[PDB]
Design a protein around this ligand. Structure first.
Ligand SMILES: CCCCCCCCCCCCCCCCCC(=O)OC[C@H](COP(=O)([O-])OCC(O)COP(=O)([O-])OC[C@@H](COC(=O)CCCCCCCCCCCCCCCCC)OC(=O)CCCCCCCCCCCCCCCCC)OC(=O)CCCCCCCCCCCCCCCCC
Ligand SMILES: CCCCCCCCCCCCCCCCCC(=O)OC[C@H](COP(=O)([O-])OCC[N+](C)(C)C)OC(=O)CCCCCCCCCCCCCCCCC
Ligand SMILES: CCCCCCCCCCCCCCCCCC(=O)OC[C@H](COP(=O)(O)OCCN)OC(=O)CCCCCCCCCCCCCCCCC
Ligand SMILES: CCCCCCCCCCCCO[C@@H]1O[C@H](CO)[C@@H](O[C@H]2O[C@H](CO)[C@@H](O)[C@H](O)[C@H]2O)[C@H](O)[C@H]1O
Ligand SMILES: CCCCCCCCCCCCO[C@@H]1O[C@H](CO)[C@@H](O[C@H]2O[C@H](CO)[C@@H](O)[C@H](O)[C@H]2O)[C@H](O)[C@H]1O
Ligand code: SF4
Ligand code: SF4
Ligand code: SF4
Lengths: 207, 94, 76, 115, 114, 114, 176, 154
């Protein structure tokens, strides 16, 4: 018990590993990877076709009972062929446990809407569509939720610029708010912070 | 604190409490605004020996995730079922 | 009212200004002779819905490519 | 006369105040300033569109109850009659029938607003 | 044991005959699982946990004691879970997730960091 | 080269969706000018609709077309339900933009941008 | 553990029933609520008499920025740019060069006070206590441009407020 | 002549600054410190400052928080719907110049791109007392107006 180091909990690591292979055994059609992190978080990585079967099994199965959808988000990784990682964070009140389910898609491929599994997903999927452009099929009412009406682009994409492409002001001539190409009085200053020396050997990637 | 006895009585009766014992205006029961200097303690790693950083480096004990299954016997649940909460003995019914 | 159908249809096409009324003929093809594009054709079809007052589903609409074809469709 | 004088003064003063209010201040009128208010965003449709009344049945019953008072307001004068035996019976009769009508509408859910 | 007046959860009505209702639902689940292939892990695992729950219901006639044994909250919560499991079993027949993986991911689809 | 469709399985199916959207936009312009009290004409608005459809006439991916129609339908829903304000509707006309000459010499005089 | 906030079945004895009928008809619980606001009417109000009376602050208060000096009058800032790097709002802009005597000093030190989040990170990062957030919070202006501070403004703030700034730093530096 | 209009300015100015009614209009964090200025310790009402929800019955707009592009047309609308004279107080870094979201694609870099601003109150958020300083600074601005004196000399 060193004061500055986070303690490691191995009973949970074993419990999550056991349930991880339990899920993989039951749903081999869709499960591609199962892993447990060093802070004890189980992640299931699945084929996108299995969004509804996997989530439904986790919600309803007596040994799962993940009744609460904590969060549904996406991550943009431009280097990947399927750049968008879709992340479901589920909570089980019965077993006081959490699980993360991950799938993927690209710009032109839709994902089945999980609203039929969790009604919480309605606005989460609207946010993912609005900020990343990932279309969800058979969504009850898909449309922008966070951006301005008529806004073009998906800001949370890595290739979308931080300050966007347009900006607003009030023009007295036309007596309304107008949109114009963005010019900044002070450009945002890019900082190169990365140290040129490796920090974490344990995560080194083979050459 | 300057209220007269009659007014103290009146607002006590109207409220139904003894308002004077727990006034909401602060007087001289608060800490002084000039305090003596502190002398704060140091942490466990303030040693001159037996203190090599490589024995107390949390970031370097972090490891990548354990791959349980990669596509490259009894049933289990994620954890034991949660115990049912017990009612409070302090005040079970508000 | 078959006789009046032909007259009404050509009345619509006269209003539409993308086409020359002297170039116009009951057999002239919208895309070929008249030089119109697809959207232009869609606009013409909408103008007929307003006139004869009934829907012209897209499956039907794309076939109607000459003034004569429209009058034939109206008959039903 | 006095009453007519009093009413004229009251509404004459009110009109004078409105006149002053409209011609004293400096005005700057333009379209956006005078556009209909609705929390910063343009109104969606006309405010002249029909506005459903959920208490419509209570509103009609008010018309019938609002005429009971005309029949009952003479009661202080009626109490001066020689024929008090007939009075009290008829006064109590009207109020009871008014109470019965209220009970009927109440028990038949006429006072519940439509959803 | 005297019947409850409330389950404590809004919208979850108190069940008058929990033991019989559970036996009906557990039997139905076992009937539905008979149409799944014997080698499917869903069948073997769901049958196992189902038979353990059904055995408890048949051996404990007291609703309080039975709730303590099932460890699933109020007995009406257990009935709801049984209904949810039965709903899943029917869906799994259409999905057939015991089939082999539909598709491998691209080479570095799950590699992190890049 | 086998991918999951969005709606239309091929260009012919996609184009039908485009024309259905175009009709809806064409029919809505008179209401938009009336409802938003725009000073433009019904012709000016309909010309703008044509211009927005014409700039995407070179697409040959049925999936890219389906997304354009999806965004067009959402764009129309905001207008009809008056979620957009007049500022949002008039952003299509860039009324406060000083025209930017597109010839080499005019660009050469004004700055370094190509 | 848990407790029930609203799960009590009221008693049905004629005294308790009659007590509640009196409550319904005589408005006793609404009268009781009137007693509470009456009691407040006769309490001394908590209002202070601003600007003649001020609210209490602490030596850690994060207010208007100022650039400080050494007792000799030399500037403490050595253009290390640690404050500019840590600024979460990118509100700091710095340029530096060797001074006429070779000293490492800034020729630009701007704080855009309409970008700043008054977070105090800059005074944590500074290794020489050059940039601080002083105790002044009453510097609202009539124009936006007046809130774009350059080095001359910030140095004047340091000279203006140094007497108080030094005393506050003296009271709190042992917690840092 | 000069003496009468001089006193008349003093009167209309005194009435306008002694009876300042801000629009009930807050945007984000800074609206919390606006509440604390209405709370007992500072009691804005004692200066004659009273919140009123309707723009028609408001004299001051206190822009208290971040102005996004989506909100910008609405803020301009309710400002235009105030009768004159009207004043705008820009409260906090976000309203003053975008602040900590200055470089965001969805934020207006200062509410003075949308409305004219009389007073800028710095801080993130300005303390309740700092806002009260700004309101009293706006009052002293109104005390210096010379509407009739200038009219007389036209
Ligand atoms: C029409 C009605 C209005 C006109 C009637 C005028 C009647 C005379 C008013 C005299 C008030 C003078 C207050 C005073 O002495 O200030 C001292 C004060 C110094 O005292 P202090 O050091 O602050 O300490 C105050 C007490 O410790 C803290 O104060 P306190 O809370 O202890 O109160 C002290 C005193 C103050 O009260 C009075 O002196 C006046 C009592 C008149 C009651 C009328 C109702 O009250 C009493 O002693 C108790 C008896 C008061 C009657 C209470 C009845 C409550 C109503 C019943 C409940 C149900 C309500 C429903 O000096 C000042 O601040 C002067 C300020 C001047 C203010 C104006 C005074 C004139 C008031 C208006 C006159 C008309 C114009
Ligand atoms: C309970 C009842 C309470 C009633 C209270 C009534 C107010 C009592 C205090 C009155 C003091 C005087 C108020 C003057 C305010 C004028 C508004 C203003 O500031 O505008 C600036 C203007 C100055 O405008 P300007 O000429 O400098 O420029 C205007 C153009 N732009 C906007 C481009 C700058 O003042 C005036 O124009 C004239 C000042 C008149 C002052 C004397 C009042 C006479 C007005 C008579 C109007 C004629 C119609 C009769 C109306 C009935 C009158 C009783
Ligand atoms: C000899 C034979 C004699 C025959 C005659 C004998 C008659 C004596 C007995 C008559 C009954 C006495 C009470 C009469 C008053 C009316 C009582 C009443 O109406 O109360 C009920 C009413 C509704 O309450 P609620 O519980 O919500 O509804 C019932 C639930 N289904 O409750 C309410 O009205 C709620 C009111 C809410 C608003 C209150 C705000 C003001 C409260 C403070 C005012 C205090 C009183 C001030 C009086 C001023 C007088 C000048
Ligand atoms: C659904 C229909 C419901 C109908 C309900 C009608 C209720 C009526 C109840 C009876 C009301 C009057 O009841 C009657 O009042 C008169 C007083 O005015 C009384 O009469 C008494 O006082 C009068 C004068 O005041 C004397 O002249 C008389 O000698 C004396 O008997 C009667 O003794 C009493 O029986
Ligand atoms: C002579 C004057 C004085 C006599 C009183 C005259 C008015 C009598 C009013 C009607 C009284 C009986 O008729 C009334 O019917 C409704 C049926 O919807 C009953 O029941 C209803 O009332 C209450 C309040 O609406 C609800 O909480 C309840 O859920 C509902 O069942 C009332 O409890 C009863 O009071
Ligand atoms: S207080 Fe924070 S935001 Fe302001 S200048 Fe310092 S570091 Fe930057
Ligand atoms: S103010 Fe301090 S931290 Fe900033 S550049 Fe100067 S010495 Fe460095
Ligand atoms: S200025 Fe600061 S407190 Fe005010 S809204 Fe912006 S971030 Fe929040």
């Amino acid at each position: 018990t060193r004061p500055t180091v986070r303690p490691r909990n191995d009973v949970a690591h074993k419990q999550l590993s056991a349930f991880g292979e339990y899920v993989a055994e039951i749903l081999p059609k869709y499960v591609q990877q199962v892993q447990v992190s060093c802070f004890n978080e189980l992640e299931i990585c699945i084929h996108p076709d299995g969004v509804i079967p996997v989530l439904t099994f986790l919600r309803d199965h007596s040994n799962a009972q993940f009744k609460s959808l904590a969060d549904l988000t996406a991550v943009d990784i431009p280097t990947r062929q399927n750049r968008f990682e879709i992340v479901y964070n589920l909570l089980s009140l019965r077993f006081n446990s959490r699980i993360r389910v991950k799938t993927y898609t690209d710009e032109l491929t839709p994902i089945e809407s999980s609203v039929p599994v969790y009604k919480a997903a309605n606005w989460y999927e609207r946010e993912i569509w609005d900020m990343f452009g990932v279309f969800f099929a058979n969504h009850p009412d898909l449309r922008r939720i966070l951006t301005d009406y008529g806004f073009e682009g998906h800001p949370f994409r890595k290739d979308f610029p931080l300050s966007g492409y347009v900006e607003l002001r009030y023009d007295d001539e036309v007596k309304r708010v107008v949109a114009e190409p963005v010019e900044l009085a002070q450009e945002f200053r890019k900082f190169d912070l990365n140290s040129p020396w490796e920090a974490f050997p344990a995560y080194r990637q083979p050459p | 604190a300057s209220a007269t006895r009659f007014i103290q009585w009146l607002r006590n009766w109207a409220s139904g409490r003894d308002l004077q014992a727990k006034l909401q205006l602060r007087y001289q029961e608060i800490s002084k605004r000039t305090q003596p200097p502190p002398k704060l303690p140091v942490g466990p790693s303030h040693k001159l020996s037996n203190n090599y950083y490589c024995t107390r480096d949390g970031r370097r004990e972090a490891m990548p995730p354990s791959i349980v299954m990669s596509s490259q016997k009894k049933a289990v649940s994620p954890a034991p079922p949660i115990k049912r909460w017990e009612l409070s003995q302090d005040e079970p019914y508000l | 009212t078959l006789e009046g159908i032909k007259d009404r249809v050509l009345y619509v096409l006269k209003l539409y200004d993308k086409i020359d009324p002297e170039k116009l003929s009951v057999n002239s093809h919208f895309m070929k002779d008249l030089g119109l594009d697809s959207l232009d054709q869609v606009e013409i079809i909408m103008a007929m819905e307003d006139e004869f007052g009934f829907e012209i589903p897209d499956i039907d609409a794309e076939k109607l490519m000459c003034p004569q074809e429209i009058v034939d469709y109206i008959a039903d | 006369m006095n009453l007519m004088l009093a009413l004229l003064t009251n509404f004459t003063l009110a009109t004078l105040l409105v006149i002053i209010a409209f011609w004293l201040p400096q005005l700057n009128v333009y379209s956006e300033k005078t556009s209909p208010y609705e929390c910063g965003f343009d109104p969606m449709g006309s405010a002249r569109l029909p506005f459903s009344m959920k208490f419509f049945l209570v509103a009609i019953t008010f018309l019938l109850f609002d005429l009971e008072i005309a029949l009952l307001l003479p009661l202080p004068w009626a109490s001066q009659t020689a024929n008090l035996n007939t009075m009290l019976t008829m006064a109590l009769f009207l109020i009871i029938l008014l109470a019965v009508s209220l009970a009927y509408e109440w028990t038949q859910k006429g006072l519940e607003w439509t959803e | 044991g005297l019947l409850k007046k409330t389950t404590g959860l809004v919208g979850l009505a108190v069940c008058e005959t929990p033991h019989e209702r559970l036996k009906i639902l557990y039997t139905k689940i076992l009937d539905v699982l008979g149409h799944i292939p014997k080698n499917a892990a869903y069948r073997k695992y769901t049958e196992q946990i189902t038979n353990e729950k059904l055995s408890m219901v048949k051996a404990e006639p007291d609703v309080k004691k039975l709730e303590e044994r099932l460890q699933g909250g109020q007995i009406e919560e257990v009935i709801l879970q049984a209904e949810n499991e039965l709903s899943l079993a029917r869906k799994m027949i259409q999905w057939k997730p015991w089939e082999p993986l539909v598709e491998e991911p691209p080479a570095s689809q799950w590699k992190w960091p890049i | 080269t086998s991918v999951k469709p969005i709606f239309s399985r091929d260009m012919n199916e996609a184009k039908r969706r485009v024309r259905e959207l175009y009709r809806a936009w064409y029919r809505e312009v008179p209401n938009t000018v009336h409802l938003f009290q725009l000073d433009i004409s019904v012709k000016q608005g309909r010309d703008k609709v044509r211009e927005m459809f014409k700039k995407n006439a070179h697409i040959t991916d049925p999936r890219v077309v389906d997304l354009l129609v999806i965004k067009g339908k959402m764009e129309l829903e905001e207008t009809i339900k008056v979620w957009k304000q007049r500022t949002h509707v008039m952003r299509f006309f860039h009324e406060t933009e000083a025209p930017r000459p597109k010839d080499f010499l005019s660009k050469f005089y004004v700055g370094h941008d190509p | 553990t848990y407790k029930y906030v609203n799960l009590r079945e009221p008693s049905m004895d004629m005294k308790s029933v009659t007590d509640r009928a009196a409550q319904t008809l005589l408005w006793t619980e609404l009268i009781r609520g009137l007693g509470m606001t009456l009691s407040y009417l006769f309490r001394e109000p908590a209002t202070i008499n601003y600007p003649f009376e001020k609210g209490p602050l602490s030596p850690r208060f994060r207010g208007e920025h100022a650039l400080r000096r050494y007792p000799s009058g030399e500037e403490r800032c050595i253009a290390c740019k640690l404050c500019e790097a840590v600024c979460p709002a990118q509100a700091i802009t710095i340029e530096a060069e060797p001074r006429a005597d070779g000293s490492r000093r800034t020729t630009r030190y701007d704080i855009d006070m309409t970008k700043c989040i008054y977070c105090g990170f800059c005074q944590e990062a500074c290794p020489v206590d050059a940039i601080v957030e002083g105790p002044n919070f009453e510097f609202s202006t009539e124009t936006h441009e007046e809130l774009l501070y350059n080095k001359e403004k910030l140095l004047n703030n340091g000279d203006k407020w140094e007497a108080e700034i030094a005393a506050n730093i003296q009271a709190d530096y042992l917690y840092r | 002549g000069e003496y009468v209009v001089a006193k008349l300015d003093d009167l209309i100015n005194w009435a306008r600054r002694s009876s300042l009614w801000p629009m009930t209009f807050g945007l984000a964090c800074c609206a919390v410190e606006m509440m604390h200025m209405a709370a007992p310790r500072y009691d804005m009402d004692r200066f004659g400052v009273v919140f009123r929800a309707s723009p028609r019955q408001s004299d001051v707009m206190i822009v208290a928080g971040t102005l996004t592009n989506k909100m910008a047309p609405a803020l301009r609308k309710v400002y235009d719907q105030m009768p004159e004279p009207r004043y705008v107080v820009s409260m906090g870094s976000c309203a003053n110049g975008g602040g900590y979201y200055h470089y965001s694609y969805s934020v207006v870099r200062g509410c003075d791109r949308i409305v004219p601003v009389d007073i800028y109150v710095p801080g993130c958020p300005p303390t309740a007392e700092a806002l009260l300083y700004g309101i009293l600074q706006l009052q002293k601005k109104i005390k210096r107006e010379k509407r009739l004196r200038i009219w007389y000399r036209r």
